[PDB]
Amino acid sequence: SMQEEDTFRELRIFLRNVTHRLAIDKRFRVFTKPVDPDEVPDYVTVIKQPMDLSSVISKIDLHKYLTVKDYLRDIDLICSNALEYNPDRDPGDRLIRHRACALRDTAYAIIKEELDEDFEQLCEEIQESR
Ligand SMILES: Cn1cc(Br)cc(N)c1=O
Ligand SMILES: [Cl-]
């Protein structure tokens, strides 16, 4: 129905706004673009599902997210990719891990404060109907 198309449009507007707020945060610059294989040629070898905020915007715009749960799986992937690729004790790795956890935590905190649970429940019920 349109009403269902209107629901998913509202979802996309909401997700673009959350993603924009994460992307303009200086802490998260490293997560804003895919990893350049020239800088890190073994990335694509270790990380099977690269994810970044640019890719998340592309996926919103392609109507790939029908729920905030599916969006948060991609945010979780940005975080777990960073924990897996940068696991060492050295400060460079610890800084990226802290920034990755802070991304996950910020996305979840914005969604806790600004997502209506009944809106998410509607999205989940339309998705389950398809
Ligand atoms: C996410 N990300 C980005 C860059 Br640039 C370099 C890394 N080692 C990494 O894990
Ligand atoms: Cl820095």
UniProtKB/Swiss-Prot annotation:
Highly expressed in estrogen receptor positive breast tumors and in osteosarcoma tumors. Induction: Up-regulated in breast, uterus, colon, ovary, and stomach tumors. Induced in breast cancer cells overexpressing NCOA3 or treated with estrogen. Down-regulated in 5-fluorouracil-resistant derivatives of the colon cancer cell line HCT 116. Residues 3-114 form the Bromo domain. Residues 108-130 form a coiled coil. It is found in: Nucleus. May be a transcriptional coactivator of the nuclear receptor ESR1 required to induce the expression of a subset of estradiol target genes, such as CCND1, MYC and E2F1. May play a role in the recruitment or occupancy of CREBBP at some ESR1 target gene promoters. May be required for histone hyperacetylation. Involved in the estrogen-induced cell proliferation and cell cycle progression of breast cancer cells. Belongs to the AAA ATPase family. Interacts with ESR1 and NCOA3 and these interactions are enhanced by estradiol. Interacts with acetylated lysine residues on histone H1.4, H2A, H2B and H3 (in vitro). This is ATPase family AAA domain-containing protein 2. The gene is ATAD2.
